[PDB]
Write a protein that binds this ligand. Structure first.
Ligand SMILES: NCC[C@@H](O)c1cccc(OCC2CCCCC2)c1
Ligand SMILES: NCC[C@@H](O)c1cccc(OCC2CCCCC2)c1
Ligand SMILES: CCCCCCCCCCCCCCCC(=O)O
Ligand SMILES: CCCCCCCCCCCCCCCC(=O)O
Ligand SMILES: [Fe+2]
Ligand SMILES: [Fe+2]
Lengths: 510, 510
């Protein structure tokens, strides 16, 4: 949990327009930047929160800004450029809001505002949002290369900002199809050197709980042998979605509703046999954005999730007007929102009818349960790993390359305090011990883990976070490097300009 | 959690017949019994697990044995006597099992085998089970005085072994009525000196979820202004219950079944206005035996519970044959049982329709939620206070006289390890810190708190537990005194004879 209030309102700087740079700045280092840290931290976020006098309304509406911190020989640079999307380019051309964003209807066509994340496919990097358009970008210059329409290649209406990436470069993602949820597989770059997106395929399909209302989907789980998909009660109303949007004046946010009675349905597919498995896993209602990690342990799937307890769409609390309120009002507004909680669910793969009415979760080191009912639904209860009053352990990251999809012990996260990011966290998922890093009037980003090259242990490395530190006596922002063992500070690299909120990203080793 | 295995099987001594004493034994003290500790620890349990060659089958079948440790001027005695119930007396007379017990059908009429608890009404003390018969006993000699049939006074078929006792001596309890659950109020002893049981009344009534199947009920919650009842999916099948029992050969255990679809329904009544309040609180399935404590905080009820996650009846795992198995087999048997978990539920008293779809739990220091649905059910999620793999924090006790029904911080409990009692626990319900007391091959009882008589703080006192320590190198049993602050040992009082399992009891100040 956080141990801090924010009466000064410095968090408002997360949602304030900035300018791009024409070339990299030097970042003033204090402490010691590890000499083995060589490469680029690449992150996305909104950077332009109004076009002239026309305002963007929602957290996810501001125009995509691609950020880069470079690390070489203990020295750091910072650079940023707006992504030249249709949304941005046409807004600059016409000097108004042209494309409808998530929560901002444009007055008189799908957004490609790639403000959320960035990931590799073959030798390329793509910025994304959650729509059918991803944007190829140059990871060294931050130039925008190409718009790619996933619909030209596979049958999906969108795809998440959280694809899983296997060690050979294979990319998996999930997307709505208008009804199913399709898993897309993009193969690694092959000898022929042609673009791996042109070899995309749907490998497996998950069914939908309601023919006319698909669930919103933000991420999914992957193990060597299984794919896990969590169907939440946040639904997309397709009657509102597929009508004339500039008639009645709609945006994406206007098309969501909550199903009060379904709870959550969890789904598994066989990854290698490409086959949906018909186990009716059921539990109580929550929103889910980020899976932490998933793994196989005997005949069981361990599914670790950042949950929000309730069926109301958490995105309702993320209009900019609310996030720009003063501290007492920010807290008041979040009182009735769903409560964040890290939960471990355990999914049995061997369902014996003879165990009807009992708990199937026979593993020795969890309190998670799974009850086989007579209708063959399997009712799940979680083991809670972390729970704090409006204190979210969010934007989770692990040592992904070596532990993604596998037995693991540690996760790192961004700590939200009534939705305001004010700390960095580490959770031991076996023991539930936590570690916190926190300074007054400091607003960090998702922490990203980078392994030490001679690491023996899961947490032998650092985490990198971009921190916004407003109010003079300090420089506006900095790159924070923390030791992954105990979250003690190793270094920081201060810059002379503001940085707004960023959502996701990656470290690119060079 | 426990840190101990039990390969020696010493826990079997908890379920072995003992002989009563004709007068008190001296208990050899080591360490220093507090000089302000003056009075008697009174506890009930089974003491006779077979009649001749006819065996009792279930944990709750053995014949009631009343235990007493006396404390005066740093010296301790121990005494025990079988309760002269109809079950016991007739078994001694006829030299066989005459009355059907909970899980033991008698070959050829309700049991009054008062093996569970003991409590005060006016100037009297009554041993109880959960039936319509309670047994008046003498707290100084341990003589049995008389049988009382609650049906002669109030309309109930039974009553729990966990009445609440207000500071003036008022007694509240709950019982099934064959359909409702009735709250019985027994007033304090008045000037006229007549037995307060003759002034018993039903003050309020809780409705039943199923006309033909009432829920099993073990305890309930009480605050200055409210009564809380938790209706679980463990049901009593009245078609099986009310048929001729010695025809098809039935016992009490044979009449229980689990409703797979209702989950848990929570109920509140206005204590002072004597009125059921019609709020449809709903959550997922669990068994519940013991409420820890209940209290009012602004317009909310805080409801702390020892839960078992699942709908299967936990009492199915408590046949003596299973509890007498070897350790590896005990653990194996408990793998599919419900998982124990301490949970805090929070019940809003102000339901505004304008908040439909949202979390009503606006308190600042909980993660518990309560969601108002369109059908007006209020779906609850808990804040988990303690969770360990088959490690139950059970038989909870608090500083009851000063904190029962009120804001509080500390609970004490008996720690079960795959149902085997092997430690004593303390839980801070605000911070979730725990403290443990544990020795190898030692099997404690429910801890009971005694305040230092001039204490101003909540945990300024001691806990008392009766501990079975088999295997030579030690005396068979002892009374354990721990400091309530940190569970560090203060003293023990060893006795030369075995003591079997005991369930509940009290400290009687003299
Ligand atoms: N990560 C926050 C949401 C944001 O990425 C976003 C911004 C703009 C549109 C949008 O749409 C999501 C839908 C796309 C089509 C298929 C259904 C989901 C989603
Ligand atoms: N504490 C463990 C259960 C035990 O007290 C017990 C032993 C024997 C009979 C019995 O009956 C409970 C029913 C009484 C009538 C009303 C329904 C519950 C209960
Ligand atoms: C760094 C963000 C701070 C302000 C917003 C915090 C509220 C986050 C709520 C949970 C996560 C929602 C998903 C956002 C990340 C994404 O777009 O992938
Ligand atoms: C000291 C008891 C040890 C053996 C039984 C442990 C299993 C207890 C399960 C939860 C509590 C059930 C109620 C027992 C006490 C009572 O009858 O009131
Ligand atoms: Fe995300
Ligand atoms: Fe009990």
């Amino acid at each position: 949990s956080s141990q801090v209030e924010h009466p000064a309102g410095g968090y408002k700087k997360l949602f304030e327009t900035v300018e791009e740079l024409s070339s990299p700045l030097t970042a003033h280092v204090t402490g010691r930047i590890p000499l083995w840290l060589t490469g680029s931290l690449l992150r996305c976020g909104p950077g332009l929160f109004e076009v002239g006098s026309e305002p963007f309304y929602h957290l996810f509406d501001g125009q995509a800004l691609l950020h880069k911190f470079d690390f070489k020989e203990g020295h750091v640079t910072y650079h940023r450029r707006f992504i030249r999307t249709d949304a941005y380019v046409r807004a600059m051309t016409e000097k108004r809001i042209v494309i409808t964003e998530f929560g901002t209807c444009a007055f008189p066509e799908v957004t490609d505002n790639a403000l959320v994340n960035i990931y590799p496919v073959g030798e390329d990097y793509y910025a994304c949002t959650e729509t059918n358009f991803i944007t190829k970008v140059n990871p060294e210059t931050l130039e925008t290369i190409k718009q790619v329409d996933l619909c030209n290649y596979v049958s999906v209406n969108g795809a998440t900002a959280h694809p899983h990436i296997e060690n050979d470069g294979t990319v998996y993602n999930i997307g709505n199809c208008f009804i199913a949820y399709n898993i897309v597989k993009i193969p690694p770059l092959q000898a022929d050197k042609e673009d791996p997106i042109s070899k995309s395929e749907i490998v497996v399909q998950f069914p939908c709980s309601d023919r006319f209302k698909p669930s919103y989907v933000h991420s999914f789980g992957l193990t060597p042998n299984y794919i896990v998909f969590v169907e939440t009660p946040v639904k997309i109303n397709l009657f509102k979605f597929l009508s004339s949007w500039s008639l009645w004046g709609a945006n994406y946010m206007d098309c969501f509703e909550s199903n009060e009675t379904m709870g959550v349905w969890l789904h598994i597919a066989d990854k290698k046999r490409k086959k949906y498995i018909n186990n009716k896993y059921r539990t109580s209602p929550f929103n889910l954005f980020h899976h932490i990690n998933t793994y196989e342990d005997h005949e069981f799937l361990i599914v670790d999730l950042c949950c929000w307890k309730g069926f109301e769409f958490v995105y309702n609390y993320l209009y900019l007007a609310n996030l720009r309120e003063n501290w007492e009002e920010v807290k008041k507004n979040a009182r009735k929102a769903p409560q964040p909680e890290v939960r471990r669910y355990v999914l049995p793969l061997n369902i014996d009818k003879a165990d009807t009415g009992k708990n199937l979760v026979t593993l020795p080191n969890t309190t998670a349960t799974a009850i086989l009912c007579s209708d063959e639904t399997i009712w799940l209860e979680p083991e809670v790993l972390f729970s704090g009053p409006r204190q979210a352990f969010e934007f989770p990251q692990i040592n992904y390359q070596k532990y993604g999809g596998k037995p693991y012990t540690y996760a790192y996260g961004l700590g939200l305090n009534h939705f305001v990011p004010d700390r960095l966290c580490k959770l031991n998922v076996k023991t539930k011990e936590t570690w916190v890093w926190q300074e007054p009037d400091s607003y960090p980003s998702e922490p990203i883990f980078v392994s030490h090259p001679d690491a023996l242990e899961e947490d032998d490395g650092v985490v990198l976070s971009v921190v916004v530190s407003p109010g003079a006596g300090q420089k506006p922002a900095y790159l924070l490097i923390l030791n992954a063992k105990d979250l003690s500070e190793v270094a920081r690299a201060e810059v002379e300009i503001n940085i707004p909120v960023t959502f996701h990203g990656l470290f690119k080793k060079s």
